[PDB]
Scaffold this active site. Structure first.
Site, PDB file in Angstrom:
ATOM      1  N   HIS A 275      25.204 -27.525 -20.694  1.00 49.32           N
ATOM      2  CA  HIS A 275      26.566 -26.995 -20.835  1.00 49.32           C
ATOM      3  C   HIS A 275      27.533 -28.154 -20.737  1.00 49.32           C
ATOM      4  CE1 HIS A 275      24.150 -23.947 -18.601  1.00 49.32           C
ATOM      5  NE2 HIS A 275      24.657 -23.117 -19.491  1.00 49.32           N
TER       6      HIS A 275
ATOM      7  N   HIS B 114      28.095 -14.647 -25.258  1.00 51.29           N
ATOM      8  CA  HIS B 114      27.415 -15.919 -25.087  1.00 51.29           C
ATOM      9  C   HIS B 114      25.909 -15.759 -25.172  1.00 51.29           C
ATOM     10  CE1 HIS B 114      26.893 -20.030 -23.268  1.00 51.29           C
ATOM     11  NE2 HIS B 114      25.764 -19.466 -22.873  1.00 51.29           N
ATOM     12  N   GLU B 115      25.366 -14.780 -24.453  1.00 50.82           N
ATOM     13  CA  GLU B 115      23.915 -14.560 -24.427  1.00 50.82           C
ATOM     14  C   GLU B 115      23.335 -13.991 -25.725  1.00 50.82           C
ATOM     15  OE1 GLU B 115      22.437 -16.129 -22.187  1.00 50.82           O
ATOM     16  OE2 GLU B 115      23.752 -16.202 -20.468  1.00 50.82           O
TER      17      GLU B 115
ATOM     18  N   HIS C  46      23.098 -16.873 -28.104  1.00 50.51           N
ATOM     19  CA  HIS C  46      21.921 -17.747 -27.874  1.00 50.51           C
ATOM     20  C   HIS C  46      20.757 -17.405 -28.818  1.00 50.51           C
ATOM     21  CE1 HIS C  46      22.691 -20.695 -24.822  1.00 50.51           C
ATOM     22  NE2 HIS C  46      22.894 -19.849 -23.828  1.00 50.51           N
TER      23      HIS C  46
ATOM     24  N   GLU D 229      24.950 -24.508 -26.240  1.00 48.12           N
ATOM     25  CA  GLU D 229      25.864 -23.880 -25.288  1.00 48.12           C
ATOM     26  C   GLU D 229      27.275 -23.716 -25.849  1.00 48.12           C
ATOM     27  OE1 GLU D 229      24.977 -22.307 -22.781  1.00 48.12           O
ATOM     28  OE2 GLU D 229      22.928 -23.100 -22.775  1.00 48.12           O
TER      29      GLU D 229
ATOM     30  N   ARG E 162      29.914 -30.136  -6.766  1.00 43.48           N
ATOM     31  CA  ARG E 162      30.847 -29.486  -7.652  1.00 43.48           C
ATOM     32  C   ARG E 162      31.424 -28.284  -6.880  1.00 43.48           C
ATOM     33  NH1 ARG E 162      28.488 -26.255 -12.680  1.00 43.48           N
ATOM     34  NH2 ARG E 162      28.442 -24.572 -11.103  1.00 43.48           N
TER      35      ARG E 162
ATOM     36  N   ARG F  85      34.689 -26.655 -21.696  1.00 43.90           N
ATOM     37  CA  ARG F  85      34.290 -25.371 -22.289  1.00 43.90           C
ATOM     38  C   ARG F  85      35.550 -24.557 -22.592  1.00 43.90           C
ATOM     39  NH1 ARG F  85      29.084 -23.219 -18.745  1.00 43.90           N
ATOM     40  NH2 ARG F  85      28.941 -21.613 -20.390  1.00 43.90           N
TER      41      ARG F  85
ATOM     42  N   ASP G 271      29.301 -20.483 -26.413  1.00 41.03           N
ATOM     43  CA  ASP G 271      30.653 -20.248 -25.880  1.00 41.03           C
ATOM     44  C   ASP G 271      31.575 -19.790 -27.004  1.00 41.03           C
ATOM     45  OD1 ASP G 271      30.743 -22.974 -23.392  1.00 41.03           O
ATOM     46  OD2 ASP G 271      29.862 -20.971 -23.279  1.00 41.03           O
TER      47      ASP G 271
END
Ligand SMILES: O=C(O)CCC(=O)N[C@@H](CC(=O)O)Cc1ccc(-c2cccc(Cl)c2)cc1
Ligand SMILES: *[C@@H]1O[C@H](CO)[C@@H](O)[C@H](O)[C@H]1NC(C)=O
Ligand SMILES: *[C@@H]1O[C@H](CO)[C@@H](O)[C@H](O)[C@H]1NC(C)=O
Ligand SMILES: *[C@@H]1O[C@H](CO)[C@@H](O)[C@H](O)[C@H]1NC(C)=O
Ligand SMILES: *[C@@H]1O[C@H](CO)[C@@H](O)[C@H](O)[C@H]1NC(C)=O
Ligand SMILES: [Zn+2]
EC number: 3.4.24.11
Length: 696
Positions: free
Chosen positions: A658, A530-531, A534, A593, A49, A664, A597
């Site tokens: 993810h 984002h975190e 979670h 995820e 990637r 995303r 997001d």
């Protein structure tokens, strides 16, 4: 009214170069944001990637090279040990001259590899039991085969550790690969050829005869065995309810409900646990509490494990270790993996030695290497700025709760408790910089010989597994960082209810005290959101402010939560991916995820609106006819400029929690009314669907 600083110019150019201004933003924002980058870049032969995120990881590696490759007077013992490890690692001419001999010397300590031992039954048969074979790989080498036993945090008691029993991992990337048809066929072929090739190399070295048909038959047996184990393991979709996964038991109870018979033995959980646990002077009785993550799997294993001989099993168990060790041996052994690497990753070559070495020593000496890194690359001043961003975004998250019409008041209040409770960790722990001796002590038991790379990594294996096992009777360390500092990533841990932002991520395009705040919120701002989010996804919501797995939701609020989130399952499950042969994403595996997001974007954008409101508009960027609301979204998208090799797309779509970057970016922006306004999107334009998914 235009910014003309050096920093503004660098921001500008990068944005301009990555984007493709001729695509319409409301047709495809990814193309719009990333089309320039896509048009101009080819995936290196060594990457599975490629893209801005991976470039950041490649550049971090360069820094690591620079700090490890050169001895200095002032180097503490901890750093000395790390550079020594590095030198052992990059000396390929020493490694090469040892052929496969270091592995040969190791083989009897694991009960040999039957296919590459003659009279295996004779040499090992009398003394071989599953309990000790399995135990050996686990306790001494960190290799979990058949049954996975580990010491970890208790989900329902986060100050403590307990023993866990779960399903093992597979040689191939996921259970899906084991159907061996269509897109998975080459991988299955490469996998078996890889085993054949290694057994052939070891036979050549030991000077033993080679019957090719025997290799084929014995290795295909290995595959047939592992195909049956793959089939017995639970799908990731049936493992994502943390409540239904946790099953606390006793070794007593386990012996009844989960008996096994191996080589007509039958299996003793208690013997097995003490084989492993004795490795660190702790003995175990049926009293012992044990968390069982794969009860159905253990059950499914009983009818399978009765069908195979000790020789059949040891063939697999050994291969699964050997598999890992082959890149650590000579050039000859390294080549044997070629087709296997190509089938899983699409790479025609292995990444630079110095790069693998830098990553290896980073991963085994995270505090020492983190120290070297932050001194070399990380501001340290950044820390306070990021601290304040977290407060702003933590703030927003709390406020958003009051506008949640689908959640009741008691659940609202308990969500706020956990939010206020979230502990943050920024840049690096100071210890690693300010306390040399403590850092020296951490690596006390490690002694590396510079011309013994293999012995070094074996020593590393034992040391890690020993540290992990010896935690069973110990309380979870509070001050312990869940990541080293030389990492381009960020983390949330439910078991500690804490968010982690390593030095590695606190740089452009995510963060810079010297870049517009639109970029900062669009980047690290989003990541912060984002975190925090979670803490409250399909997984984190099951955990309270202290990291304990307790339900704090009313039937109704939880149930509503699932409704809202069902939207995103269908949204992402209906994305289909050309690179992966037109397969669609797993909207369940990627739910957490995707929730994170979507949450993160809203919080970060609302914080940026707050910032404009408190401080006014920022100076514009030269060359770009976009206002800052638009710049927020651009930078946000360009985090994910990049692309995949089809091989690796096939892999990651089964294994990554993810969604792929393009998706995303599409998924979040489609759900964002705020994006469509910034960009003036027509209703039902591709970026602006009528139905929009919302949870946080
Ligand atoms: O590199 C990989 O394979 C995964 C990297 C990865 O996602 N790490 C995360 C670790 C985790 O999951 O908390 C941290 C993270 C990084 C970037 C973003 C982000 C930024 C801009 C736009 C969008 Cl839609 C998402 C969100 C979270
Ligand atoms: C690599 O191999 C051996 C170690 O014994 C030695 O000839 C040589 O000094 C080493 N080279 C480097 C650069 O360490
Ligand atoms: C896979 O497992 C399921 C349930 O145990 C069963 O229907 C089937 O026998 C297995 N299939 C194969 C191909 O082994
Ligand atoms: C486990 O069982 C074997 C015999 O099957 C025995 O020799 C050994 O002492 C036992 N191991 C432990 C760690 O208690
Ligand atoms: C695609 O969306 C439809 C309608 O929302 C839904 O019923 C279906 O299950 C989704 N498909 C996938 C694979 O998620
Ligand atoms: Zn995440």
């Amino acid at each position: 009214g235009i910014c003309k600083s050096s920093d503004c110019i660098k921001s500008a150019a990068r944005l301009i170069q990555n984007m493709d201004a001729t695509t319409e933003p409301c047709t495809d924002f990814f193309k719009y944001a990333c089309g320039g980058w896509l048009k101009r870049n080819v995936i290196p032969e060594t990457s599975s990637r490629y893209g801005n995120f991976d470039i950041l990881r490649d550049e971090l590696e360069v820094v690591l090279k620079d700090v490890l490759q050169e001895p200095k007077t002032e180097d503490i013992v901890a750093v000395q040990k790390a550079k020594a490890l590095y030198r052992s690692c990059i000396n390929e001419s020493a490694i090469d001259s040892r052929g496969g001999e270091p592995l040969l010397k190791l083989l009897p300590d694991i009960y040999g590899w039957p296919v590459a031992t003659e009279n295996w039954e004779q040499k090992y048969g009398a003394s071989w039991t599953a309990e000790k074979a399995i135990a050996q790989l686990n306790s001494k080498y960190g290799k979990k085969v058949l049954i996975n036993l580990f010491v970890g945090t208790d989900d329902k008691n986060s100050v403590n550790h307990v023993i866990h029993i779960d399903q093992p991992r597979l040689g191939l990337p996921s259970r899906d690969y084991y159907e061996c048809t269509g897109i998975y066929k080459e991988a299955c072929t490469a996998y078996v050829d890889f085993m054949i090739s290694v057994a052939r190399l070891i036979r050549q070295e030991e000077r033993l005869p080679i019957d090719e048909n025997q290799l084929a038959l014995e290795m295909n047996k290995v595959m047939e065995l592992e195909k049956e184990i793959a089939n017995a393991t639970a799908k990731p979709e049936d493992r994502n309810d943390p409540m239904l996964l946790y099953n606390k038991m006793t070794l007593a109870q386990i012996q009844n409900n989960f008996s096994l018979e191996i080589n007509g033995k039958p299996f003793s959980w208690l013997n097995f646990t003490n084989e492993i646990m004795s490795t660190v002077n702790i003995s175990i009785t049926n009293e012992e509490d044990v968390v069982v993550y794969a009860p159905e799997y253990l059950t499914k294993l009983k009818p399978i494990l009765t069908k195979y001989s000790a020789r059949d099993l040891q063939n697999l168990m050994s291969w699964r270790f050997i598999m890992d060790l082959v890149s650590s041996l000579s050039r000859t052994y390294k080549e044997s993996r070629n087709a296997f690497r190509k089938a899983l990753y699409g790479t025609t070559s292995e990444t630079a030695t110095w790069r693998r070495c830098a990553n290896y020593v980073n991963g085994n000496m995270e505090n020492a290497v983190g120290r070297l890194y932050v001194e070399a690359a990380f501001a340290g001043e950044s820390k306070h700025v990021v601290e304040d961003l977290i407060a702003q975004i933590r703030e927003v998250f709390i406020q958003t709760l009051d506008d949640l019409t689908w959640m009741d008041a008691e659940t609202k209040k308990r969500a706020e408790e956990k939010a206020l409770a979230i502990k943050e960790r920024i840049g690096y722990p100071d210890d690693i910089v300010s306390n040399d001796n403590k850092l020296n002590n951490e690596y006390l038991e490690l002694n590396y010989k510079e011309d013994e790379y293999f012995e070094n990594i074996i020593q590393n294996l034992k040391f890690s597994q020993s540290k992990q096992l010896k935690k069973l009777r110990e309380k979870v360390d509070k001050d312990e960082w869940i990541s080293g500092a030389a990492v381009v990533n960020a983390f949330y841990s439910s078991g500690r209810n804490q968010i982690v932002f390593p030095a590695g991520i606190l740089q452009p395009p995510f963060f810079s005290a010297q870049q517009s705040n639109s970029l900062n919120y669009g980047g690290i701002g989003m990541v912060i959101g984002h975190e925090i989010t979670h803490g409250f996804d399909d997984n984190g919501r099951n955990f309270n402010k202290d990291g304990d797995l307790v339900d704090w939701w009313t039937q109704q609020s939880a149930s509503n939560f699932k409704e809202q989130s069902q939207c995103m399952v269908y949204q992402y499950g209906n994305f289909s991916w050309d690179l992966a042969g037109g397969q669609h994403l797993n909207g369940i595996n990627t739910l957490g995820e995707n929730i994170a997001d979507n949450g993160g974007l809203g919080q970060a954008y609302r914080a940026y609106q707050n910032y404009i409101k408190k401080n006014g508009e920022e100076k514009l960027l030269p060359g770009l006819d976009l206002n800052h609301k638009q710049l927020f979204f651009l930078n946000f998208a360009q985090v994910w400029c990049g692309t995949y090799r089809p091989e690796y797309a096939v892999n990651s779509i089964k294994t990554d929690v993810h969604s792929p970057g393009n998706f995303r970016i599409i998924g979040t922006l489609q759900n964002s009314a705020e994006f469509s306004e910034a960009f003036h999107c027509r209703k039902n334009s591709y970026m602006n669907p009528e139905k929009k998914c919302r949870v946080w």
